[PDB]
Amino acid sequence: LSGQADMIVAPLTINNERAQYIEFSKPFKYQGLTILVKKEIPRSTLDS
Amino acid sequence: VNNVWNGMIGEVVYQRAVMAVGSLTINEERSEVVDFSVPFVETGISVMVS
């Protein structure tokens, strides 16, 4: 919304609030959210 | 066919009925003629094999 503007290209996201001011294009990707957690350390190795 | 649209796209383009709510897939030629809104269901070409 300033002099820089131009044709911003980045992993943006299509949102209602964002779209109320600027206008997007047809998406070039599709994604969800997919909560991420650290992998559990497997302690079951029949050591004992 | 021969630049004579038919179907839902034809009905929309001939000023007979606005809006085409249904199972319509976004393409390039259609978007060149009759503009779409933002997609609400993602889809594509896929194959079943039994």
Q: Rounded to an integer, what distance in angstroms lies between the CA atom of residue B18 and that of residue A24? A: 23
* CB-side neighbour CA atoms (13 Å) of A45: 4
Instruction: Tell me the backbone φ, ψ of residue B30, rounded to 5 degrees.
Output: -60, -45
The method recorded for this entry reads cryo-EM
CB pairs under 8 A between A and B: 5
Long-range contacts of B5-9 (CB under 8 A, 24+ apart): B5/B33, B9/B33, B9/B34
Q: Rounded to an integer, what distance in angstroms lies between the CA atom of residue B9 and that of residue B12? A: 5
Query: Which residue of chain A comes nearest to B28, CA vs CA?
Result: A26
- Asked whether B35 and B12 are in contact (CB, 8 A), the reply is no
* CB-side neighbour CA atoms (13 Å) of A47: 4
Q: Hey, is the C-beta of B44 within 8 angstroms of any chain A C-beta?
A: no
Q: What one-letter code names the amino acid at A17? A: E
Resolution (A): 3.7
Chain A: give the shortest CA distance to residue B34, in Å: 15
- Asked whether B34 and B13 are in contact (CB, 8 A), the reply is yes
